């Protein structure tokens, strides 16, 4: 009766169809049928991301691909727990109020200029999206954006005030491309190809360093009239209280180990998922120091995303076990040989940066990383590059809303116009496809 | 500075002491020190139950007992997912309103007698604790219990009105001993020895059948003046609305497979953790049927308990890998050989039924189930008996509060007196040790 209710039934039919008509070895048919089924569900999202993810293992088990416990073990992957540390790390400095004090101590640095205001709102958003989330950083930033945009409230000066709204929403997504925690897509890559925190930072951090300015400039060089305006510093001051230094200290300590995991771990015996152990040690320190209770983490934590990780890891394992990964690498063998690696990384980047416009960032990476990664292995190529690429290009949702939550968040402000974003993003999208392929090429040898 | 801050430090010292001074094989010292460390933290709860569970694997990895991913895989055990299905099954029919209509159509069947009133409050409380929880059944029941206790509202009629309060608080804990979902302890046992849903019902349901009257009778035949009073059935009725039948259908369908899982699965190819597959199919049915959103399930779900499941399983594996499980079976060889099995099951039953007074029901099973189970294995004994027993006897917290949350819930009403509960449970405790050993003995040959 509902829209989504139909996709699910249409998708069940599409699966039943592909299943009974594809003319290949059953193992490959099964993998192809499953892949199409999930690919639709995750891209239309007729069912919640996590429900689809939970559907992966239950399918693999009934179709004899794996035994129940084998499939489920994907959900205990060490990266899933490193991402859980990121949440508890967030939950702490929010329940501590350390995220609000971070905004204030910065916005006061702008003595009163709207010029040095919106430009600080962008920087704060991207910085906070490195650790918290992207959807969460938007919701927590939007009021702070509408607050500053109330002295110069004249909305007939819209362009000063859609530049700020669209500015933060983009800063949230570009900030998430900075660290392994920040956006689910980044974790899906690390869990698929086994990346370290500092490994993904070698790639992501410089890219985010670059992409954030390139994105604001594009917004500036339309109708920016922000060189005018004044502030309305109405609010209670902040001050470092009980173990906000401790929390801030713990946090810094944790990020320190994450960055330096390589030598510290080697000089300790070479533990397995060292970054994961650090993330779990953070969860412990924060609780011994009493600075954050568990109910906080259970709320802050996105357990659906964690369940999702298991489904993508399970999906990747289904593609291999069924041989579908090699079956597809064959059908592309000629087509990809006609193409260089430049053409390859450029075609991929383009495909996702626009595919991610119609679906969630993570729901896109959840589907694309398993396929392209396992196929890249059939070609005997290291899936790091393609994976890292897809993870970054997935976070490049700038056109219409519905691409990322941060879009629909600043869009529900009833102030920015559909058409406006649809064309500012069409320019940014192209700028990224350029920047990405550039960086991707250099990140070759 | 804090009390718990002190227990944690006292426990940290005790480990350092035991570690450097105990004169046994290093692995056994490590296991013994770890076992004691965790045993204190879980029994004092200076740290949250779930925090401790995460503490197990991080230790096992740093002390070379396991590799990070091997240790972490414990948290993806199939039972953890079977309990997650229980949550989604609850969350659905609560957000659906299916739980209140059960009260009305039943509580209205009690036309108005306080005699047939308190006697119906007991049945509903225990019945809902079969699927939901024990802590949740108390909090969700207390208002509905205080409602009926307003006609004979005279607190000078205390005995009519403490019999009802303590009655439900006990019914919450006794109802959870009915099915595998209902109390974490039941799951902790099943996950340790790999029980099926219907298996634990063979034990738990009959045991629950008996214990509920034995507990009510004791309350009735003390200071009960409840045969008097009159009803005030005050509230707008409900009516079978949007997919409350669907929920009931899905729910009923799920429970049907659980009871008959044995033949259905055997007549299907012998899938591995069939009960787990059913639990996840419920999450799917509930989502395909649109009857509950994921935000709903993610809220209702107790993720801390799920992580705890992982911690106990990891702990059990630490006992074996270090040999501590067999080291203890040697120290008890004479003591236990000097004893019969009656002596064994009766000492065990008593030990927990009174131990569970000082710590959470689940926090107790988290510590005792791993130890007793792995030691029983070293003796070449099936760890089912002790586990089910310990799991069931662990849920028997009737005396003071702080034994179970359901106790502290009806107790914070500021009406029942420390001495009152402290002695009704002290008598009830003895009745159970009898009943348990009886049933436990009969469930032998
Ligand atoms: Na973030
Ligand atoms: Na997207
Ligand atoms: Na229950
Ligand atoms: Na207890």
What distinguishing features does this structure have?
0% strand; homodimer; binds sodium ion; 23 helices; transmembrane helix (chains A, B); 445 residues; mainly alpha
Chain-wise SSE layout:
Two copies of one chain form a homodimer.
Chain A: H1 3-21, H2 26-44, H3 49-62, H4 68-72, H5 78-95, H6 98-107, H7 115-128, H8 135-148, H9 159-175, H10 184-193, H11 197-220, H12 244-259, H13 261-266, H14 274-288, H15 294-300, H16 303-321, H17 324-331, H18 333-337, H19 341-355, H20 361-378, H21 384-394, H22 405-411, H23 418-442
Helix pairs in contact in A: 1-2, 2-3, 2-20, 3-16, 5-10, 5-14, 5-15, 5-16, 6-7, 7-8, 7-9, 8-9, 8-22, 9-11, 9-22, 10-16, 10-20, 10-21, 11-23, 12-14, 16-20, 17-20, 19-21, 19-23, 20-21, 21-23
Bound molecules: sodium ion (4 copies).
Residues 356, 359-361, 364, 397, 403-404 of chain B line the site of one sodium ion.
Domain Citrate transporter-like (chains A, B): 40-386
GO molecular function (chains A, B): identical protein binding; succinate transmembrane transporter activity; transmembrane transporter activity
Binding site for fumarate (chains A, B): 134-135, 183, 361-362
**Rg calc of chain A:** 22 Å
Number of helices of chain A: 23
User: How many discrete domains of chain A?
Assistant: 1
Distance between the termini of chain A: 54 Å
From N to C, what is the helix and strand string of chain A? HHHHHHHHHHHHHHHHHHHHHHH
Helical proportion of chain A, percent range: over 70%
Residue share in β-strands of chain A: under 5%
Return the structural class of chain A.
mainly alpha
Give the tally of β-strands of chain A.
Answer: 0
Question: Given the C-alpha coordinates, what overall shape of chain A results?
Answer: globular
Membrane topology (chains A, B): Multi-pass membrane protein
Transmembrane segments (chains A, B): 4-22, 51-69, 75-94, 130-149, 161-183, 203-223, 243-260, 266-289, 301-319, 339-356, 363-382, 388-412, 424-444
Binding site for succinate 3 (chains A, B): 134-135, 360-361
Subcellular location (chains A, B): Membrane
């Amino acid at each position: 009766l509902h829209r989504n209710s139909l996709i699910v039934l249409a998708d069940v039919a599409l699966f039943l169809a592909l299943y009974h008509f594809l003319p290949f070895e059953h193992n490959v048919v099964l993998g192809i049928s499953m892949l199409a089924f999930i690919a639709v569900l995750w891209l239309t999202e007729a069912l919640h991301v996590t429900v689809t993810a939970i559907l992966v293992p239950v399918m693999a088990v009934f179709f004899g691909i794996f035994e129940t416990q084998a499939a489920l073990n994907n959900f205990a992957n060490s990266i899933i727990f490193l991402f859980l540390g990121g949440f508890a790390l967030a939950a702490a400095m929010h329940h501590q109020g350390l995220d609000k004090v971070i905004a204030d101590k910065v916005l006061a640095m702008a003595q009163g200029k709207m010029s040095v205001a919106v430009f600080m709102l962008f920087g704060v958003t991207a910085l906070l999206s490195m650790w918290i989330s992207n959807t969460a950083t938007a919701a927590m930033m939007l009021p702070l954006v509408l607050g500053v945009l109330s002295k110069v409230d004249a909305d007939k000066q819209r362009s000063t005030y859609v530049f700020v709204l669209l500015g933060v929403a983009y800063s949230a997504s570009i900030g998430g491309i900075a660290t392994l925690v920040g956006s689910p897509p980044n974790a899906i890559a690390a869990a698929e190809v086994g990346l370290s925190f500092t490994d993904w930072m070698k790639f992501g951090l410089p890219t985010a360093m670059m992409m954030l300015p390139m994105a604001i400039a594009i917004l500036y060089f339309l109708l920016k009239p922000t060189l005018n305006g004044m502030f309305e510093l109405d609010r209670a001051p902040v001050n470092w209280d009980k173990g906000k230094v401790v929390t801030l200290g713990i946090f810094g300590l944790t990020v320190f180990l994450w960055i330096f995991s390589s030598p510290i771990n080697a000089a300790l015996g070479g533990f397995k998922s060292f970054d994961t152990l650090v993330a779990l040690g953070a969860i412990l320190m924060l609780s011994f120091a009493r600075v954050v209770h568990w109910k906080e983490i259970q709320k802050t934590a996105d357990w659906g995303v964690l369940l999702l990780f298991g489904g993508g890891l399970c999906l990747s394992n289904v593609l291999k076990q069924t041989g579908t990964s090699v079956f597809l690498a064959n059908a592309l063998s000629d087509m990809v040989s006609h193409m260089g690696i430049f053409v390859v990384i450029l075609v991929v980047a383009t495909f996702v940066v626009f595919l991610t416009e119609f679906a969630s960032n993570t729901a896109s990476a959840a589907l694309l990383i398993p396929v392209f990664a396992t196929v890249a292995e059939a070609f005997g190529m290291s899936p790091v590059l393609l994976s890292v690429l897809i993870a970054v290009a997935a976070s490049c949702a700038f056109m219409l809303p519905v691409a990322t939550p941060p879009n629909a968040i600043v869009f529900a402000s009833g102030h920015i116009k559909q058409s406006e974003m649809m064309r500012v993003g069409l320019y940014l999208n192209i700028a990224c496809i350029g920047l990405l392929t550039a960086i991707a090429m250099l990140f070759w040898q």
